[PDB]
């Protein structure tokens, strides 16, 4: 039965001999369930990419990372609770510059999103950065961090976190990889030319999913992750999180 | 005692009240608003609705379990096995009846669970399993470590999936109905496996003698089949 539930249900008072549980009373429970919703549960701003390129004297100097949630492991076990997911990605780029007193100049950065299926002749100065079809954003170092919303891009109705099958129709696709789902690459470079300064730029990319729709909840993964490409397990030698003992050991059953 | 007859065959079954519809929904034909392909799907009337009985597995005290990926066991069987390679796309549901016959002197418990989108894994290696290791065919496979469900998850939490309990006290048979679970409306028979049928002996077998063999029969009825991309 599908019904609207704003808060947890109340309790009816109880009341010789029968042919249920215990003696209860009348309680009005005002505790809100709103924070347990799938939206509130899965949606949080987390750091999915951390990279600092070495920049001192160049007289490679950028980064592109195909987005997958398996890189941040706290989010991986977070998103492996469900099978199919439907959400809109909200990306925010933060730029911090360290020192290897001069003072900090204000660099201009360009964060360009390249969808899956666009050939990239990857270079810093190559023309694929100036392509008008690719959506780009320009932001300085001192300002509110650049924030864009990525829509839901898929051939199917929702993403596949656990994919049982193989890639393509050549009968060899590296088990556990879904051909239908790849969002694309996120290309970020410094717009300014080469300045012989020893400052290191640290870019942080945050992703908060919204409009989240989940299906088929799955058991959590107790064992550690061996690799990001598949489900293989090993387990710690001693308990906990082992093959023999996942739960901690105690003295005796009567203890 | 009540017999379930669908198609040109049938099997006598034990009465079990309140069977399991997976996630509380009954499989139905593809609605018009969710359709994609503009062609006309061929609908078998009694053809794909007959009960397909796999090979009965011998269940001993030291048996870890068994798993059958759908429709991998059905890849080649009967007339439905023809439409596997004879059509480019399909969507179907499944009515699974698992019946374990034993006397009143046997003790044990069987957890029959249908795992949607089951991604397996290998122990103590980073190498992804091969093609024959995943897709068994009619033979099936045996769990190496059923306590972790071979995927690294926990068996104690496996009850979140559609399941029924086979206990040698109350009910010796189970009936599970699986609708179409996919992101896409239709899928490819030889590539992706939507469900997985896992029979896990949570409590092992026991008796006075050391050697005891209790057979298990698994029956699968592909209800609400559709097919597109006619070739050959």
């Amino acid at each position, epitope marked *: 039965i599908e019904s609207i539930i704003k808060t947890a249900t109340d309790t009816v008072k109880s009341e010789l001999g029968v042919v249920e549980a215990i003696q209860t009373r009348t309680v009005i429970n005002q505790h809100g369930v709103s924070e347990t919703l799938v939206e509130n549960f899965l949606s949080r701003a987390a750091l999915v990419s951390k990279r600092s390129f070495e920049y001192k004297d160049h007289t490679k100097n950028f980064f592109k990372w195909t987005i997958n949630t398996r890189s941040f492991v706290q989010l991986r076990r977070k998103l492996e609770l469900f099978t199919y997911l439907r959400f809109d990605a909200e990306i925010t780029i933060l730029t911090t510059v360290a020192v290897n007193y001069v003072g900090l100049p204000d660099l201009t950065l360009q964060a360009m999103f390249v969808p899956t299926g666009a050939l990239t002749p990857e270079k810093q100065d190559s023309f694929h950065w100036q392509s008008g079809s690719n959506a780009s954003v320009f932001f300085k170092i001192s300002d509110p961090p650049a924030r864009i919303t990525i829509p839901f891009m898929c051939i199917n109705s929702a993403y596949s976190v656990f994919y049982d099958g193989f*890639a393509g129709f*050549e009968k*060899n*696709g*590296l*088990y556990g990889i879904n051909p239908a789902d790849t969002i694309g690459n996120l290309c970020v470079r410094i717009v300014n030319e080469h300045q012989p300064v020893g400052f290191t730029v640290t870019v942080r990319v945050y992703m908060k999913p919204k409009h989240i729709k989940a299906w088929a909840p799955r058991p959590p993964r107790t064992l550690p992750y*061996m690799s990001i*490409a598949n489900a293989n397990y*090993k387990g710690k030698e001693r308990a906990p999180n082992a093959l023999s003992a996942i739960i901690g050991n105690r003295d005796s059953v009567k203890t | 005692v009540l017999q379930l007859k669908l198609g040109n065959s049938a099997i006598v079954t034990q009465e079990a009240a309140n069977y399991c519809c997976a996630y509380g929904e009954w499989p139905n034909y593809l609605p018009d608003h969710e359709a994609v392909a503009i062609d006309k799907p061929t609908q078998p009337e009694t053809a794909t609705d007959r009960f397909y009985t796999l090979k009965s597995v011998k269940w001993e005290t030291g048996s870890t379990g068994w798993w059958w990926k759908l429709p991998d066991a059905l890849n080649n069987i009967g007339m439905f096995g023809q439409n596997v390679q004879h059509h480019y796309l399909y969507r179907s549901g499944f009515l699974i009846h698992v019946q374990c016959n034993a006397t009143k002197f046997h003790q044990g418990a069987l957890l029959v669970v249908a795992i949607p989108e089951h991604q397996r894994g*290998a*122990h*103590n*290696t*980073n*190498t*992804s*399993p*091969g*093609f*024959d*290791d995943i897709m068994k065919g009619e033979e099936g496979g*045996t769990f*190496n470590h059923p306590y972790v469900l071979d995927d690294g998850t926990s068996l104690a939490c496996a009850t979140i999936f559609p399941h029924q309990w086979i206990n040698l006290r109350t009910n010796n048979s189970a009936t599970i109905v699986l609708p179409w679970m996919n992101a896409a409306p239709m899928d490819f028979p030889l590539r992706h496996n939507q469900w997985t049928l896992a029979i896990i002996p949570v409590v092992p077998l026991g008796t006075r003698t050391t050697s005891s063999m209790v057979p298990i029969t698994v029956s699968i009825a592909p209800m609400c089949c559709e097919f597109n991309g006619l070739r050959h």
Partner: antibody
Amino acid sequence: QVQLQQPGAELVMPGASVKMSCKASGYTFTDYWMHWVKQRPGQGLEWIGAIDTSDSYTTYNRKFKGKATLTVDESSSTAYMQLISLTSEDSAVYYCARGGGGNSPFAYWGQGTLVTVSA
Amino acid sequence: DIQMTQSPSSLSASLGERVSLTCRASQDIGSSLNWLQQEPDGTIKRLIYATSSLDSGVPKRFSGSRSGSDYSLTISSLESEDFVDYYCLQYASFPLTFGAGTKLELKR
């Protein structure tokens, strides 16, 4: 400290069977995989198969499927390779490797055997 | 099955000459690849594992890098014992496969 022992010649007439032996020491044998690789005189290397040391589960090549059988013994800490229906097609140097959780590598190899069959 | 194409199958070079062997995979195997050194005496020994990292006990003259569609084995300087049969192996997915092999020759 860690090595692999696979000596012997083992010349045999066609149509017979052979059970190889790989005995590993210097580490924990039950916790690591076992592998098998053949060295042909024709300048080539083929992958025989892999076996989990724990109980049973194995993986075989399509060409050698059904002609090879792998089994291990956790007591003697040995690895055995069973072959049936030996023809003149099989002549090669069989190797056994280990692997592991990380890298699942080939790092340690055995000496190998010289296998020649003749009618 | 994923096939590893090892090229060239043979080459002729003298001492102090940098050579490279490029293997191409049909399906992307990730960062998992191995290089095996086969000595003429019948003993195979690993060299490169997981791209960058190198075996301990093996001299630093061996090196490797990834073009991102391809894998290459770069040797700084050849030696008398550096003439062997090189094999690029993929441990990423079952079944595991071998390269075609490469035999080194000396200019005479």
